[PDB]
């Protein structure tokens, strides 16, 4: 399987730099061009530029030639993009994507959200949303995790290490009055098996290197 795994979200102070990585596996790294692509929030997509990992040859969008610096480590099968002199308009999801012929872009990393802000990174607190008599409905129980007071985005939430995905809703974040974000992740399950199944939410906030697993049990 072709895979591109990107580095984690980070907050960057205005004016500073950040260096993003893109680890390639499942193919010969030097046999495909690596592209990088910007997607601003709500926005669409902009090509930043290209690197040929066999030799380090690059080309850039004129729009990004002063903003972006591209390199590789062939022995780590990893491409890098360094973004310089970061401003507000640079807050965006950045993708790496491979191109076999400089035509289509056939495999994509998962994206790195770069937030440009003077505000400090903070990890979330995680609290259970326990299933109880007030969270049942026609043979189903709802349960969840409240992920509160983090910065910047994003948080990810899985259930049972990714084995529980049916019926999971991880809501879009809200901006609190504090300037910190919060969200909940919920799931509906059979009320019959509240005694016998185990539900754990796996919360990850990469900007603060914070990981919390919370077993959510009946109240």
């Amino acid at each position: 399987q072709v895979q591109l795994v990107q580095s984690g979200a980070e907050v960057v102070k205005p004016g500073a730099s950040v260096k993003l990585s893109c680890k390639a596996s499942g193919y010969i790294f030097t046999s495909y061009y690596m592209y990088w692509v910007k997607q601003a929030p709500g926005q669409g997509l902009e090509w930043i530029g290209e690197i040929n990992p066999s030799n380090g040859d690059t080309n850039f969008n004129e729009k990004f030639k002063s903003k972006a610096t591209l390199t590789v480590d062939k022995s780590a099968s990893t491409a890098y993009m360094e973004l310089s002199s970061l401003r507000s308009e640079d807050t965006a999801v950045y993708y790496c994507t491979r191109s076999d012929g400089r035509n289509d872009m056939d495999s994509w990393g998962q994206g790195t959200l770069v937030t440009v802000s003077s505000a400090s990174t903070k990890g979330p607190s995680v609290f259970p949303l326990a299933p109880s008599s007030k969270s049942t409905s026609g043979g189903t129980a709802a349960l969840g995790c409240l992920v509160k007071d983090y910065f910047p985005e994003p948080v990810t939430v899985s259930w049972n290490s990714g084995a529980l995905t049916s019926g999971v809703h991880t809501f879009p974040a809200v901006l609190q009055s504090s300037g910190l974000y919060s969200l909940s992740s919920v799931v509906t399950v059979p009320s019959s098996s509240l005694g016998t199944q185990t539900y754990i939410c796996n919360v990850n906030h990469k900007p603060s290197n914070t990981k919390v697993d919370k077993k959510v049990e009946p109240k």
Binding site: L45, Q110, L129, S132, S135, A142, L146, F171, V174
Partner: protein, 215 residues
């Protein structure tokens, strides 16, 4: 090169044909081949390659997708829409440097009216220990998106101190879910008795209240 996608949004029922357009500001075809590609972006995911060189299905992509066109005018077609086709669709040319992308078409999926199922969650004992009380009201698997949530505390309508968030359309059933969270200090929380989420939605003939008594 500027790629202009139309329409901006397209609303379609499962089983029906979907057709979206991408116009290039100049020609992106040689005499034999066309350098337009189409991607699908589902929420939180990167774009995924569907079609390359105008009409070549990417391996692994379902057969309901096709593409056509030459010169400047290109189309993507879903022959028979599935609910999992909820997505934004982008075109991209590879004729000149730099490659550029269109502004996207958002595909919305129509379905029948579904009333929300409503669940309420008192604050955890953990959270209360830290000085704050979040009360979460969940509205699950409803359609259409329009819904109203009001909080009542000892029957009194609350005027602020809540925030709502709505999901995107579900990829399997095309519904929405919504969370409303009421946030109070522990001290404010403990001065009242009854906490209620009152939910209005067109699939309900009168508002539905879910409540609990503190303790």
């Amino acid at each position: 090169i500027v790629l202009t996608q139309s329409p901006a949004t397209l609303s379609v029922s499962p089983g029906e044909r979907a057709t979206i357009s991408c116009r290039a500001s100049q020609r992106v075809s040689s005499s034999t081949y066309s350098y337009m590609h189409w991607y699908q972006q589902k929420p939180g995911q990167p774009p995924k390659l569907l079609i390359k060189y105008a009409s070549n299905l990417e391996s692994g992509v379902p057969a309901r997708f096709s593409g056509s066109g030459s010169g400047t005018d290109f189309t993507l077609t879903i022959s028979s829409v599935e609910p999992e086709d909820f997505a934004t669709y982008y075109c991209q040319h590879s004729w000149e440097x730099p490659p550029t992308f269109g502004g996207g078409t958002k595909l919305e999926i129509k379905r029948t009216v579904a009333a929300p199922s409503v669940f309420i969650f008192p604050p955890s004992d953990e959270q209360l220990k830290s000085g704050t009380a979040s009360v979460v009201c969940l509205l699950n698997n409803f359609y259409p998106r329009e819904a109203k949530v009001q909080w009542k505390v000892d029957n009194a309508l609350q005027s602020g101190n809540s925030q709502e968030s709505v999901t995107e359309q579900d990829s399997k059933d095309s519904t929405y879910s919504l969370s409303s969270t009421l946030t109070l200090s522990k001290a404010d929380y403990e001065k009242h008795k009854v906490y209620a989420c009152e939910v209005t939605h067109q699939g309900l003939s009168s508002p539905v209240t879910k409540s609990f008594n503190r303790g």
